């Protein structure tokens, strides 16, 4: 019944600060915790607040850079983390405990808020065709693609022929380069006989830079 809704994703420069909100959609004698998860990592407790006792608790790892508050008028809890570093890149979760102890299980969870910390700046991608040839042809089917190079931040979305072509499409998760920029590729396998009769275009959308590219991919 009760839902916890968190503010949206954030992209932050090292040394800055982020404040994430967690609004209780309805349903307050419960403790609230903040828990983060670095990509491909486990869960880490940041601290909590118990609004009806007006007391908070911070893990000592974060103490001096974290603040957890709760606003009773709107039953919104907040977690502010300052002096951000690249290792603070994570999904941040808000969760409500089953009672007023932090010992109790966390039975209601927000949806998570992605926070990315990086020194990179918003940049649209350069899109290159990956042309089909004899060397990407096997058994009468041809592989062709798009290389979406050097963009920041995530996400990019890719479609083929404005959505009319879906089967045979494999859009790969991006690599994060040492430059701080991302690159990904998208490929589609099609009948080799269709190369003279059908045109193939990848539609790349990079909303953070307000950029869309339609790239024709020819033999």
């Amino acid at each position: 019944q009760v839902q916890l809704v968190q503010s949206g994703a954030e992209v932050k420069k090292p040394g800055s600060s982020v404040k994430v909100s967690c609004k209780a959609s309805g349903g307050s004698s419960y403790a609230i915790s903040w828990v983060r998860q670095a990509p491909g990592q486990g869960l880490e407790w940041m601290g909590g607040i118990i609004p009806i006792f007006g007391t908070a608790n911070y893990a000592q790892k974060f103490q001096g850079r974290v603040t957890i508050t709760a606003d009773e008028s709107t039953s919104t809890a907040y977690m502010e983390l300052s002096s951000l570093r690249s290792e603070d890149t994570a999904v941040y979760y808000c969760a409500r405990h089953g009672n007023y102890y932090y010992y109790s299980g966390m039975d209601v969870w927000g949806q998570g808020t992605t926070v990315t910390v990086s020194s990179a700046s918003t940049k649209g991608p350069s899109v290159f065709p990956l042309a089909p040839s004899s060397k990407s042809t096997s058994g009468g089917t041809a592989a062709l693609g798009c290389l979406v190079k050097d963009y920041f931040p995530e996400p990019v979305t890719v479609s083929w022929n404005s959505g009319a072509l879906t089967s045979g499409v494999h859009t790969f998760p991006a690599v994060l380069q040492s430059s701080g920029l991302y690159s990904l590729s998208s490929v589609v396998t099609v009948p080799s006989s269709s190369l003279g009769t059908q045109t193939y275009i990848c539609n790349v959308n990079h909303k953070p830079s307000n950029t869309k590219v339609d790239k024709r991919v020819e033999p």
Binding site: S33, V35, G40, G42, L43, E44, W45, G47, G48, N57, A59, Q60, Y93, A95, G98, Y102, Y103, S104, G105, M106, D107, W109, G110, Q111, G112, S126, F128, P129, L130, A131, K135, S136, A143, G145, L147, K149, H170, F172, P173, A174, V175, L176, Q177, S178, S183, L184, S185, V187
Partner: protein, 211 residues
């Protein structure tokens, strides 16, 4: 602070045990809670106060606690159960909550599958922009672990390589990508470049060459 097996393998409708090992100041004197995390979503409470079941959680899950270690049990193991599992408890010496590192429940077993590998050379459009990227796309492999090595000629190269972690596909097999960055002159100067993909001790190599 708490330790779990990083991975756990078993077959359908079997029974699995996930151990959680702590110390006196956390598991020893505090309740243990278990969380299930499905891919790409928020953790969910599975077990609370050592052994109680939330509403809506299947009877197949159970927890127990003895001394400074705890254990989660799943019986009648099913495909839905593949997920990460975390134990958690309060710690009176850290005065905070601690989790275990988590346990991936690989529910057995999908057929082994060899990677399909496609290697693209740099586009003329990119070379004309004075850069060159070799793109090696690796799909449909199981289980989800590969290593990728590149060769300039028949000589290894490790400069300019960026490889992704593997990621699970729609069909429950895995995919990865690897990129080799070169100058337009490294590209033309050699007679070929190769992407070599090793999967479960066996290797598939694709080769490309300037026009």
């Amino acid at each position: 602070v708490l330790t779990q097996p990083p991975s756990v393998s078993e077959a359908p409708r079997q029974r699995v045990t996930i151990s959680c090992s702590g110390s006196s100041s956390n598991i020893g004197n505090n309740a243990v809670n278990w969380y299930q995390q499905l891919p790409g979503k928020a953790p969910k409470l599975l077990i609370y106060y050592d052994d109680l079941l939330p509403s809506g959680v299947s009877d197949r899950f159970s927890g127990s606690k003895s001394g400074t270690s705890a254990s989660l049990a799943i019986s009648g193991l099913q495909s839905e159960d593949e997920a990460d599992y975390y134990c958690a408890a309060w710690d009176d010496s850290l005065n905070g909550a601690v989790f275990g590192g988590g346990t991936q429940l690989t529910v057995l077993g999908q057929p082994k599958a060899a990677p399909s590998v496609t290697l693209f050379p740099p586009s003329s459009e990119e070379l004309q922009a004075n850069k060159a990227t070799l793109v090696c796309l690796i799909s449909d492999f199981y289980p989800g672990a590969v290593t990728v090595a590149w060769k300039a000629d028949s000589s290894p190269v490790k400069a300019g390589v960026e490889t992704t972690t593997p990621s699970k596909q729609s069909n429950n097999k895995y995919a990865a990508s690897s990129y080799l960055s070169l100058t337009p002159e490294q590209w033309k100067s050699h007679r070929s470049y190769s992407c070599q993909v090793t999967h479960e001790g066996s290797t598939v190599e694709k080769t490309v060459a300037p026009t």
